[PDB]
């Protein structure tokens, strides 16, 4: 919060108005999945696929 | 009262001196006006005179001592 000050010759604030208390917020939300997928066939992994790790 | 006091002031121009009955009537009227316009103010406290311990300060609005000036009535206007 932030405030402002009055300046008077003798300290009168009856005529004027006071400060208001406005409250604000910052919001955070979730994003999207970061997904990666692979697929291969049984015979492919049986003959060709080596050193898969 | 106004008319009598005026009569006494302007009687010199016609050079007529006033009578004791007129003087008495003017006196009574002026005295009645004086009674109607009295104030008789009271004696406020000095200011350094202590307030008693039985007045329950620190809980009531009273302090240890009398204000000695018109006390604050609002707080928005605190200078007077």
PDB file of N, CA, C and O in Angstrom, chain B:
ATOM      1  N   UNK B   1     -37.363  51.612  27.125  1.00  0.00           N
ATOM      2  CA  UNK B   1     -36.018  52.008  27.523  1.00  0.00           C
ATOM      3  C   UNK B   1     -35.354  52.836  26.430  1.00  0.00           C
ATOM      4  O   UNK B   1     -34.741  53.879  26.699  1.00  0.00           O
ATOM      5  N   UNK B   2     -35.486  52.387  25.178  1.00  0.00           N
ATOM      6  CA  UNK B   2     -34.866  53.102  24.067  1.00  0.00           C
ATOM      7  C   UNK B   2     -35.440  54.510  23.957  1.00  0.00           C
ATOM      8  O   UNK B   2     -34.703  55.494  23.810  1.00  0.00           O
ATOM      9  N   UNK B   3     -36.765  54.630  24.050  1.00  0.00           N
ATOM     10  CA  UNK B   3     -37.397  55.932  23.919  1.00  0.00           C
ATOM     11  C   UNK B   3     -37.056  56.866  25.061  1.00  0.00           C
ATOM     12  O   UNK B   3     -36.879  58.068  24.861  1.00  0.00           O
ATOM     13  N   UNK B   4     -36.972  56.331  26.281  1.00  0.00           N
ATOM     14  CA  UNK B   4     -36.624  57.177  27.418  1.00  0.00           C
ATOM     15  C   UNK B   4     -35.191  57.680  27.311  1.00  0.00           C
ATOM     16  O   UNK B   4     -34.912  58.851  27.601  1.00  0.00           O
ATOM     17  N   UNK B   5     -34.278  56.767  26.996  1.00  0.00           N
ATOM     18  CA  UNK B   5     -32.856  57.160  26.918  1.00  0.00           C
ATOM     19  C   UNK B   5     -32.713  58.173  25.785  1.00  0.00           C
ATOM     20  O   UNK B   5     -31.966  59.140  25.959  1.00  0.00           O
ATOM     21  N   UNK B   6     -33.440  57.992  24.688  1.00  0.00           N
ATOM     22  CA  UNK B   6     -33.417  58.998  23.598  1.00  0.00           C
ATOM     23  C   UNK B   6     -33.982  60.319  24.111  1.00  0.00           C
ATOM     24  O   UNK B   6     -33.380  61.353  23.828  1.00  0.00           O
ATOM     25  N   UNK B   7     -35.065  60.290  24.875  1.00  0.00           N
ATOM     26  CA  UNK B   7     -35.704  61.558  25.293  1.00  0.00           C
ATOM     27  C   UNK B   7     -34.704  62.345  26.122  1.00  0.00           C
ATOM     28  O   UNK B   7     -34.597  63.553  25.900  1.00  0.00           O
ATOM     29  N   UNK B   8     -33.979  61.679  27.016  1.00  0.00           N
ATOM     30  CA  UNK B   8     -33.060  62.413  27.918  1.00  0.00           C
ATOM     31  C   UNK B   8     -31.985  63.078  27.067  1.00  0.00           C
ATOM     32  O   UNK B   8     -31.607  64.211  27.375  1.00  0.00           O
ATOM     33  N   UNK B   9     -31.501  62.380  26.050  1.00  0.00           N
ATOM     34  CA  UNK B   9     -30.427  62.924  25.185  1.00  0.00           C
ATOM     35  C   UNK B   9     -30.888  64.124  24.351  1.00  0.00           C
ATOM     36  O   UNK B   9     -30.076  65.039  24.171  1.00  0.00           O
ATOM     37  N   UNK B  10     -32.111  64.123  23.827  1.00  0.00           N
ATOM     38  CA  UNK B  10     -32.534  65.212  22.904  1.00  0.00           C
ATOM     39  C   UNK B  10     -33.262  66.365  23.604  1.00  0.00           C
ATOM     40  O   UNK B  10     -33.669  67.291  22.892  1.00  0.00           O
ATOM     41  N   UNK B  11     -33.468  66.318  24.916  1.00  0.00           N
ATOM     42  CA  UNK B  11     -34.279  67.365  25.597  1.00  0.00           C
ATOM     43  C   UNK B  11     -33.570  68.725  25.618  1.00  0.00           C
ATOM     44  O   UNK B  11     -34.265  69.740  25.768  1.00  0.00           O
ATOM     45  N   UNK B  12     -32.243  68.750  25.516  1.00  0.00           N
ATOM     46  CA  UNK B  12     -31.466  70.017  25.566  1.00  0.00           C
ATOM     47  C   UNK B  12     -31.841  70.941  24.411  1.00  0.00           C
ATOM     48  O   UNK B  12     -31.796  72.157  24.605  1.00  0.00           O
ATOM     49  N   UNK B  13     -32.138  70.387  23.242  1.00  0.00           N
ATOM     50  CA  UNK B  13     -32.408  71.210  22.037  1.00  0.00           C
ATOM     51  C   UNK B  13     -33.627  72.108  22.249  1.00  0.00           C
ATOM     52  O   UNK B  13     -33.612  73.251  21.792  1.00  0.00           O
ATOM     53  N   UNK B  14     -34.660  71.599  22.899  1.00  0.00           N
ATOM     54  CA  UNK B  14     -35.858  72.428  23.166  1.00  0.00           C
ATOM     55  C   UNK B  14     -35.646  73.134  24.506  1.00  0.00           C
ATOM     56  O   UNK B  14     -36.581  73.800  24.971  1.00  0.00           O
ATOM     57  N   UNK B  15     -34.474  72.947  25.120  1.00  0.00           N
ATOM     58  CA  UNK B  15     -34.118  73.593  26.412  1.00  0.00           C
ATOM     59  C   UNK B  15     -35.177  73.309  27.464  1.00  0.00           C
ATOM     60  O   UNK B  15     -35.547  74.239  28.181  1.00  0.00           O
ATOM     61  N   UNK B  16     -35.658  72.076  27.524  1.00  0.00           N
ATOM     62  CA  UNK B  16     -36.598  71.712  28.603  1.00  0.00           C
ATOM     63  C   UNK B  16     -35.814  70.796  29.536  1.00  0.00           C
ATOM     64  O   UNK B  16     -35.247  69.822  29.029  1.00  0.00           O
ATOM     65  N   UNK B  17     -35.735  71.124  30.824  1.00  0.00           N
ATOM     66  CA  UNK B  17     -35.030  70.249  31.799  1.00  0.00           C
ATOM     67  C   UNK B  17     -35.918  69.052  32.148  1.00  0.00           C
ATOM     68  O   UNK B  17     -37.147  69.211  32.088  1.00  0.00           O
ATOM     69  N   UNK B  18     -35.378  67.865  32.495  1.00  0.00           N
ATOM     70  CA  UNK B  18     -36.217  66.696  32.758  1.00  0.00           C
ATOM     71  C   UNK B  18     -36.821  66.673  34.169  1.00  0.00           C
ATOM     72  O   UNK B  18     -36.327  67.385  35.012  1.00  0.00           O
ATOM     73  N   UNK B  19     -37.874  65.878  34.387  1.00  0.00           N
ATOM     74  CA  UNK B  19     -38.513  65.809  35.690  1.00  0.00           C
ATOM     75  C   UNK B  19     -38.069  64.555  36.443  1.00  0.00           C
ATOM     76  O   UNK B  19     -37.689  63.554  35.826  1.00  0.00           O
ATOM     77  N   UNK B  20     -38.095  64.592  37.778  1.00  0.00           N
ATOM     78  CA  UNK B  20     -37.672  63.411  38.549  1.00  0.00           C
ATOM     79  C   UNK B  20     -38.485  62.164  38.249  1.00  0.00           C
ATOM     80  O   UNK B  20     -37.931  61.058  38.282  1.00  0.00           O
ATOM     81  N   UNK B  21     -39.778  62.299  37.952  1.00  0.00           N
ATOM     82  CA  UNK B  21     -40.570  61.128  37.588  1.00  0.00           C
ATOM     83  C   UNK B  21     -40.071  60.509  36.288  1.00  0.00           C
ATOM     84  O   UNK B  21     -39.965  59.282  36.175  1.00  0.00           O
ATOM     85  N   UNK B  22     -39.760  61.346  35.296  1.00  0.00           N
ATOM     86  CA  UNK B  22     -39.215  60.842  34.038  1.00  0.00           C
ATOM     87  C   UNK B  22     -37.871  60.168  34.277  1.00  0.00           C
ATOM     88  O   UNK B  22     -37.586  59.098  33.720  1.00  0.00           O
ATOM     89  N   UNK B  23     -37.023  60.782  35.106  1.00  0.00           N
ATOM     90  CA  UNK B  23     -35.730  60.177  35.407  1.00  0.00           C
ATOM     91  C   UNK B  23     -35.901  58.815  36.068  1.00  0.00           C
ATOM     92  O   UNK B  23     -35.204  57.856  35.720  1.00  0.00           O
ATOM     93  N   UNK B  24     -36.836  58.709  37.015  1.00  0.00           N
ATOM     94  CA  UNK B  24     -37.071  57.436  37.687  1.00  0.00           C
ATOM     95  C   UNK B  24     -37.582  56.380  36.714  1.00  0.00           C
ATOM     96  O   UNK B  24     -37.141  55.226  36.755  1.00  0.00           O
ATOM     97  N   UNK B  25     -38.518  56.753  35.837  1.00  0.00           N
ATOM     98  CA  UNK B  25     -39.045  55.789  34.876  1.00  0.00           C
ATOM     99  C   UNK B  25     -37.954  55.299  33.933  1.00  0.00           C
ATOM    100  O   UNK B  25     -37.857  54.095  33.647  1.00  0.00           O
ATOM    101  N   UNK B  26     -37.118  56.218  33.444  1.00  0.00           N
ATOM    102  CA  UNK B  26     -36.004  55.822  32.591  1.00  0.00           C
ATOM    103  C   UNK B  26     -35.047  54.902  33.334  1.00  0.00           C
ATOM    104  O   UNK B  26     -34.544  53.924  32.767  1.00  0.00           O
ATOM    105  N   UNK B  27     -34.785  55.201  34.611  1.00  0.00           N
ATOM    106  CA  UNK B  27     -33.899  54.356  35.403  1.00  0.00           C
ATOM    107  C   UNK B  27     -34.453  52.945  35.540  1.00  0.00           C
ATOM    108  O   UNK B  27     -33.715  51.965  35.382  1.00  0.00           O
ATOM    109  N   UNK B  28     -35.748  52.815  35.837  1.00  0.00           N
ATOM    110  CA  UNK B  28     -36.329  51.482  35.985  1.00  0.00           C
ATOM    111  C   UNK B  28     -36.303  50.713  34.670  1.00  0.00           C
ATOM    112  O   UNK B  28     -35.991  49.513  34.648  1.00  0.00           O
ATOM    113  N   UNK B  29     -36.624  51.382  33.559  1.00  0.00           N
ATOM    114  CA  UNK B  29     -36.592  50.700  32.267  1.00  0.00           C
ATOM    115  C   UNK B  29     -35.183  50.228  31.924  1.00  0.00           C
ATOM    116  O   UNK B  29     -34.985  49.085  31.481  1.00  0.00           O
ATOM    117  N   UNK B  30     -34.185  51.091  32.132  1.00  0.00           N
ATOM    118  CA  UNK B  30     -32.809  50.704  31.845  1.00  0.00           C
ATOM    119  C   UNK B  30     -32.356  49.570  32.752  1.00  0.00           C
ATOM    120  O   UNK B  30     -31.638  48.668  32.311  1.00  0.00           O
ATOM    121  N   UNK B  31     -32.763  49.596  34.024  1.00  0.00           N
ATOM    122  CA  UNK B  31     -32.405  48.516  34.936  1.00  0.00           C
ATOM    123  C   UNK B  31     -33.003  47.193  34.481  1.00  0.00           C
ATOM    124  O   UNK B  31     -32.348  46.148  34.556  1.00  0.00           O
ATOM    125  N   UNK B  32     -34.253  47.216  34.015  1.00  0.00           N
ATOM    126  CA  UNK B  32     -34.865  45.992  33.505  1.00  0.00           C
ATOM    127  C   UNK B  32     -34.122  45.472  32.280  1.00  0.00           C
ATOM    128  O   UNK B  32     -33.901  44.261  32.145  1.00  0.00           O
ATOM    129  N   UNK B  33     -33.725  46.370  31.375  1.00  0.00           N
ATOM    130  CA  UNK B  33     -32.923  45.943  30.228  1.00  0.00           C
ATOM    131  C   UNK B  33     -31.603  45.324  30.679  1.00  0.00           C
ATOM    132  O   UNK B  33     -31.156  44.306  30.129  1.00  0.00           O
ATOM    133  N   UNK B  34     -30.964  45.932  31.678  1.00  0.00           N
ATOM    134  CA  UNK B  34     -29.714  45.397  32.206  1.00  0.00           C
ATOM    135  C   UNK B  34     -29.914  43.998  32.773  1.00  0.00           C
ATOM    136  O   UNK B  34     -29.073  43.114  32.571  1.00  0.00           O
ATOM    137  N   UNK B  35     -31.019  43.782  33.491  1.00  0.00           N
ATOM    138  CA  UNK B  35     -31.322  42.444  33.996  1.00  0.00           C
ATOM    139  C   UNK B  35     -31.522  41.460  32.854  1.00  0.00           C
ATOM    140  O   UNK B  35     -31.088  40.305  32.935  1.00  0.00           O
ATOM    141  N   UNK B  36     -32.190  41.898  31.786  1.00  0.00           N
ATOM    142  CA  UNK B  36     -32.421  41.012  30.651  1.00  0.00           C
ATOM    143  C   UNK B  36     -31.123  40.656  29.938  1.00  0.00           C
ATOM    144  O   UNK B  36     -31.026  39.590  29.321  1.00  0.00           O
ATOM    145  N   UNK B  37     -30.112  41.520  30.019  1.00  0.00           N
ATOM    146  CA  UNK B  37     -28.910  41.294  29.222  1.00  0.00           C
ATOM    147  C   UNK B  37     -27.700  40.967  30.101  1.00  0.00           C
ATOM    148  O   UNK B  37     -26.614  41.523  29.911  1.00  0.00           O
ATOM    149  N   UNK B  38     -27.875  40.079  31.076  1.00  0.00           N
ATOM    150  CA  UNK B  38     -26.779  39.651  31.937  1.00  0.00           C
ATOM    151  C   UNK B  38     -26.108  38.389  31.397  1.00  0.00           C
ATOM    152  O   UNK B  38     -26.690  37.628  30.621  1.00  0.00           O
ATOM    153  N   UNK B  39     -24.861  38.175  31.824  1.00  0.00           N
ATOM    154  CA  UNK B  39     -24.107  36.983  31.444  1.00  0.00           C
ATOM    155  C   UNK B  39     -23.576  36.248  32.676  1.00  0.00           C
ATOM    156  O   UNK B  39     -23.802  35.041  32.824  1.00  0.00           O
ATOM    157  N   UNK B  40     -22.894  36.963  33.570  1.00  0.00           N
ATOM    158  CA  UNK B  40     -22.316  36.422  34.803  1.00  0.00           C
ATOM    159  C   UNK B  40     -21.460  35.200  34.470  1.00  0.00           C
ATOM    160  O   UNK B  40     -21.897  34.057  34.672  1.00  0.00           O
ATOM    161  N   UNK B  41     -20.271  35.383  33.902  1.00  0.00           N
ATOM    162  CA  UNK B  41     -19.434  34.230  33.560  1.00  0.00           C
ATOM    163  C   UNK B  41     -18.843  33.570  34.795  1.00  0.00           C
ATOM    164  O   UNK B  41     -18.746  34.173  35.867  1.00  0.00           O
ATOM    165  N   UNK B  42     -18.441  32.314  34.629  1.00  0.00           N
ATOM    166  CA  UNK B  42     -17.904  31.498  35.709  1.00  0.00           C
ATOM    167  C   UNK B  42     -16.382  31.436  35.644  1.00  0.00           C
ATOM    168  O   UNK B  42     -15.759  31.805  34.647  1.00  0.00           O
ATOM    169  N   UNK B  43     -15.788  30.950  36.733  1.00  0.00           N
ATOM    170  CA  UNK B  43     -14.337  30.905  36.889  1.00  0.00           C
ATOM    171  C   UNK B  43     -13.832  29.521  36.492  1.00  0.00           C
ATOM    172  O   UNK B  43     -14.038  28.544  37.219  1.00  0.00           O
ATOM    173  N   UNK B  44     -13.163  29.441  35.346  1.00  0.00           N
ATOM    174  CA  UNK B  44     -12.591  28.187  34.885  1.00  0.00           C
ATOM    175  C   UNK B  44     -11.374  27.815  35.730  1.00  0.00           C
ATOM    176  O   UNK B  44     -10.819  28.632  36.470  1.00  0.00           O
ATOM    177  N   UNK B  45     -10.960  26.554  35.617  1.00  0.00           N
ATOM    178  CA  UNK B  45      -9.810  26.078  36.370  1.00  0.00           C
ATOM    179  C   UNK B  45      -8.522  26.700  35.839  1.00  0.00           C
ATOM    180  O   UNK B  45      -8.436  27.139  34.690  1.00  0.00           O
ATOM    181  N   UNK B  46      -7.508  26.739  36.707  1.00  0.00           N
ATOM    182  CA  UNK B  46      -6.268  27.437  36.379  1.00  0.00           C
ATOM    183  C   UNK B  46      -5.517  26.736  35.254  1.00  0.00           C
ATOM    184  O   UNK B  46      -5.095  27.373  34.282  1.00  0.00           O
ATOM    185  N   UNK B  47      -5.336  25.423  35.365  1.00  0.00           N
ATOM    186  CA  UNK B  47      -4.651  24.682  34.326  1.00  0.00           C
ATOM    187  C   UNK B  47      -3.570  23.758  34.844  1.00  0.00           C
ATOM    188  O   UNK B  47      -3.358  22.674  34.294  1.00  0.00           O
ATOM    189  N   UNK B  48      -2.873  24.178  35.897  1.00  0.00           N
ATOM    190  CA  UNK B  48      -1.921  23.323  36.589  1.00  0.00           C
ATOM    191  C   UNK B  48      -2.502  22.720  37.859  1.00  0.00           C
ATOM    192  O   UNK B  48      -1.778  22.052  38.602  1.00  0.00           O
ATOM    193  N   UNK B  49      -3.778  22.946  38.124  1.00  0.00           N
ATOM    194  CA  UNK B  49      -4.429  22.358  39.285  1.00  0.00           C
ATOM    195  C   UNK B  49      -4.647  20.871  39.041  1.00  0.00           C
ATOM    196  O   UNK B  49      -5.285  20.504  38.048  1.00  0.00           O
ATOM    197  N   UNK B  50      -4.141  19.992  39.900  1.00  0.00           N
ATOM    198  CA  UNK B  50      -4.272  18.557  39.643  1.00  0.00           C
ATOM    199  C   UNK B  50      -5.712  18.087  39.737  1.00  0.00           C
ATOM    200  O   UNK B  50      -6.528  18.639  40.476  1.00  0.00           O
ATOM    201  N   UNK B  51      -6.015  17.054  38.966  1.00  0.00           N
ATOM    202  CA  UNK B  51      -7.272  16.327  39.083  1.00  0.00           C
ATOM    203  C   UNK B  51      -7.066  15.210  40.092  1.00  0.00           C
ATOM    204  O   UNK B  51      -5.995  14.593  40.142  1.00  0.00           O
ATOM    205  N   UNK B  52      -8.083  14.951  40.909  1.00  0.00           N
ATOM    206  CA  UNK B  52      -7.926  13.987  41.980  1.00  0.00           C
ATOM    207  C   UNK B  52      -7.688  12.584  41.455  1.00  0.00           C
ATOM    208  O   UNK B  52      -7.968  12.267  40.298  1.00  0.00           O
ATOM    209  N   UNK B  53      -7.143  11.736  42.329  1.00  0.00           N
ATOM    210  CA  UNK B  53      -6.898  10.345  41.971  1.00  0.00           C
ATOM    211  C   UNK B  53      -8.189   9.552  41.837  1.00  0.00           C
ATOM    212  O   UNK B  53      -8.197   8.509  41.176  1.00  0.00           O
ATOM    213  N   UNK B  54      -9.276  10.024  42.437  1.00  0.00           N
ATOM    214  CA  UNK B  54     -10.552   9.351  42.359  1.00  0.00           C
ATOM    215  C   UNK B  54     -11.344   9.602  41.101  1.00  0.00           C
ATOM    216  O   UNK B  54     -12.451   9.076  40.964  1.00  0.00           O
ATOM    217  N   UNK B  55     -10.814  10.397  40.174  1.00  0.00           N
ATOM    218  CA  UNK B  55     -11.488  10.659  38.910  1.00  0.00           C
ATOM    219  C   UNK B  55     -11.207   9.597  37.859  1.00  0.00           C
ATOM    220  O   UNK B  55     -11.727   9.707  36.743  1.00  0.00           O
ATOM    221  N   UNK B  56     -10.398   8.587  38.181  1.00  0.00           N
ATOM    222  CA  UNK B  56     -10.153   7.439  37.311  1.00  0.00           C
ATOM    223  C   UNK B  56      -9.574   7.877  35.961  1.00  0.00           C
ATOM    224  O   UNK B  56     -10.202   7.744  34.910  1.00  0.00           O
ATOM    225  N   UNK B  57      -8.364   8.423  36.015  1.00  0.00           N
ATOM    226  CA  UNK B  57      -7.659   8.620  34.760  1.00  0.00           C
ATOM    227  C   UNK B  57      -7.033   7.303  34.307  1.00  0.00           C
ATOM    228  O   UNK B  57      -6.993   6.318  35.050  1.00  0.00           O
ATOM    229  N   UNK B  58      -6.578   7.294  33.050  1.00  0.00           N
ATOM    230  CA  UNK B  58      -6.042   6.128  32.346  1.00  0.00           C
ATOM    231  C   UNK B  58      -7.151   5.172  31.928  1.00  0.00           C
ATOM    232  O   UNK B  58      -6.902   4.205  31.201  1.00  0.00           O
ATOM    233  N   UNK B  59      -8.377   5.430  32.383  1.00  0.00           N
ATOM    234  CA  UNK B  59      -9.555   4.704  31.934  1.00  0.00           C
ATOM    235  C   UNK B  59     -10.619   5.642  31.381  1.00  0.00           C
ATOM    236  O   UNK B  59     -11.214   5.363  30.333  1.00  0.00           O
ATOM    237  N   UNK B  60     -10.875   6.754  32.060  1.00  0.00           N
ATOM    238  CA  UNK B  60     -11.774   7.780  31.558  1.00  0.00           C
ATOM    239  C   UNK B  60     -10.997   8.786  30.711  1.00  0.00           C
ATOM    240  O   UNK B  60      -9.769   8.750  30.622  1.00  0.00           O
ATOM    241  N   UNK B  61     -11.738   9.697  30.080  1.00  0.00           N
ATOM    242  CA  UNK B  61     -11.116  10.704  29.230  1.00  0.00           C
ATOM    243  C   UNK B  61     -10.243  11.678  30.013  1.00  0.00           C
ATOM    244  O   UNK B  61      -9.368  12.317  29.420  1.00  0.00           O
ATOM    245  N   UNK B  62     -10.454  11.801  31.321  1.00  0.00           N
ATOM    246  CA  UNK B  62      -9.720  12.773  32.119  1.00  0.00           C
ATOM    247  C   UNK B  62      -8.236  12.430  32.197  1.00  0.00           C
ATOM    248  O   UNK B  62      -7.840  11.262  32.186  1.00  0.00           O
ATOM    249  N   UNK B  63      -7.414  13.475  32.268  1.00  0.00           N
ATOM    250  CA  UNK B  63      -5.980  13.360  32.479  1.00  0.00           C
ATOM    251  C   UNK B  63      -5.651  13.703  33.931  1.00  0.00           C
ATOM    252  O   UNK B  63      -6.539  13.888  34.766  1.00  0.00           O
ATOM    253  N   UNK B  64      -4.353  13.786  34.240  1.00  0.00           N
ATOM    254  CA  UNK B  64      -3.967  14.163  35.596  1.00  0.00           C
ATOM    255  C   UNK B  64      -4.347  15.597  35.933  1.00  0.00           C
ATOM    256  O   UNK B  64      -4.528  15.913  37.114  1.00  0.00           O
ATOM    257  N   UNK B  65      -4.460  16.472  34.936  1.00  0.00           N
ATOM    258  CA  UNK B  65      -4.604  17.898  35.185  1.00  0.00           C
ATOM    259  C   UNK B  65      -5.710  18.469  34.311  1.00  0.00           C
ATOM    260  O   UNK B  65      -6.032  17.933  33.248  1.00  0.00           O
ATOM    261  N   UNK B  66      -6.287  19.570  34.779  1.00  0.00           N
ATOM    262  CA  UNK B  66      -7.328  20.245  34.022  1.00  0.00           C
ATOM    263  C   UNK B  66      -6.731  20.878  32.767  1.00  0.00           C
ATOM    264  O   UNK B  66      -5.571  21.302  32.777  1.00  0.00           O
ATOM    265  N   UNK B  67      -7.534  21.051  31.682  1.00  0.00           N
ATOM    266  CA  UNK B  67      -7.000  21.566  30.436  1.00  0.00           C
ATOM    267  C   UNK B  67      -6.614  23.041  30.567  1.00  0.00           C
ATOM    268  O   UNK B  67      -5.577  23.405  30.066  1.00  0.00           O
ATOM    269  N   UNK B  68      -7.461  23.847  31.206  1.00  0.00           N
ATOM    270  CA  UNK B  68      -7.167  25.279  31.396  1.00  0.00           C
ATOM    271  C   UNK B  68      -7.458  26.044  30.125  1.00  0.00           C
ATOM    272  O   UNK B  68      -7.205  27.257  30.105  1.00  0.00           O
ATOM    273  N   UNK B  69      -7.982  25.364  29.106  1.00  0.00           N
ATOM    274  CA  UNK B  69      -8.325  25.983  27.799  1.00  0.00           C
ATOM    275  C   UNK B  69      -9.520  25.183  27.275  1.00  0.00           C
ATOM    276  O   UNK B  69      -9.818  24.147  27.885  1.00  0.00           O
ATOM    277  N   UNK B  70     -10.213  25.636  26.233  1.00  0.00           N
ATOM    278  CA  UNK B  70     -11.352  24.795  25.801  1.00  0.00           C
ATOM    279  C   UNK B  70     -10.771  23.439  25.422  1.00  0.00           C
ATOM    280  O   UNK B  70      -9.820  23.412  24.627  1.00  0.00           O
ATOM    281  N   UNK B  71     -11.290  22.315  25.949  1.00  0.00           N
ATOM    282  CA  UNK B  71     -10.727  21.011  25.651  1.00  0.00           C
ATOM    283  C   UNK B  71     -11.080  20.552  24.233  1.00  0.00           C
ATOM    284  O   UNK B  71     -12.065  21.021  23.691  1.00  0.00           O
ATOM    285  N   UNK B  72     -10.273  19.646  23.676  1.00  0.00           N
ATOM    286  CA  UNK B  72     -10.502  19.176  22.287  1.00  0.00           C
ATOM    287  C   UNK B  72     -11.881  18.526  22.216  1.00  0.00           C
ATOM    288  O   UNK B  72     -12.216  17.739  23.118  1.00  0.00           O
ATOM    289  N   UNK B  73     -12.633  18.858  21.171  1.00  0.00           N
ATOM    290  CA  UNK B  73     -13.998  18.296  21.017  1.00  0.00           C
ATOM    291  C   UNK B  73     -14.024  17.273  19.878  1.00  0.00           C
ATOM    292  O   UNK B  73     -14.923  16.416  19.907  1.00  0.00           O
ATOM    293  N   UNK B  74     -13.090  17.333  18.921  1.00  0.00           N
ATOM    294  CA  UNK B  74     -13.222  16.408  17.763  1.00  0.00           C
ATOM    295  C   UNK B  74     -11.981  15.549  17.529  1.00  0.00           C
ATOM    296  O   UNK B  74     -12.098  14.321  17.630  1.00  0.00           O
ATOM    297  N   UNK B  75     -10.840  16.162  17.248  1.00  0.00           N
ATOM    298  CA  UNK B  75      -9.636  15.397  16.889  1.00  0.00           C
ATOM    299  C   UNK B  75      -9.336  15.599  15.426  1.00  0.00           C
ATOM    300  O   UNK B  75      -8.158  15.533  15.071  1.00  0.00           O
ATOM    301  N   UNK B  76     -10.353  15.846  14.604  1.00  0.00           N
ATOM    302  CA  UNK B  76     -10.094  16.216  13.189  1.00  0.00           C
ATOM    303  C   UNK B  76      -9.485  17.616  13.207  1.00  0.00           C
ATOM    304  O   UNK B  76      -8.554  17.858  12.435  1.00  0.00           O
ATOM    305  N   UNK B  77     -10.026  18.509  14.041  1.00  0.00           N
ATOM    306  CA  UNK B  77      -9.467  19.880  14.208  1.00  0.00           C
ATOM    307  C   UNK B  77      -8.756  19.881  15.555  1.00  0.00           C
ATOM    308  O   UNK B  77      -9.416  20.214  16.548  1.00  0.00           O
ATOM    309  N   UNK B  78      -7.461  19.539  15.664  1.00  0.00           N
ATOM    310  CA  UNK B  78      -6.838  19.445  16.967  1.00  0.00           C
ATOM    311  C   UNK B  78      -6.102  20.689  17.460  1.00  0.00           C
ATOM    312  O   UNK B  78      -5.807  20.738  18.633  1.00  0.00           O
ATOM    313  N   UNK B  79      -5.824  21.646  16.578  1.00  0.00           N
ATOM    314  CA  UNK B  79      -5.032  22.843  16.968  1.00  0.00           C
ATOM    315  C   UNK B  79      -5.790  23.658  18.013  1.00  0.00           C
ATOM    316  O   UNK B  79      -5.140  24.164  18.945  1.00  0.00           O
ATOM    317  N   UNK B  80      -7.108  23.793  17.852  1.00  0.00           N
ATOM    318  CA  UNK B  80      -7.928  24.512  18.851  1.00  0.00           C
ATOM    319  C   UNK B  80      -8.769  23.506  19.646  1.00  0.00           C
ATOM    320  O   UNK B  80      -8.547  23.411  20.870  1.00  0.00           O
TER     321      UNK B  80
END
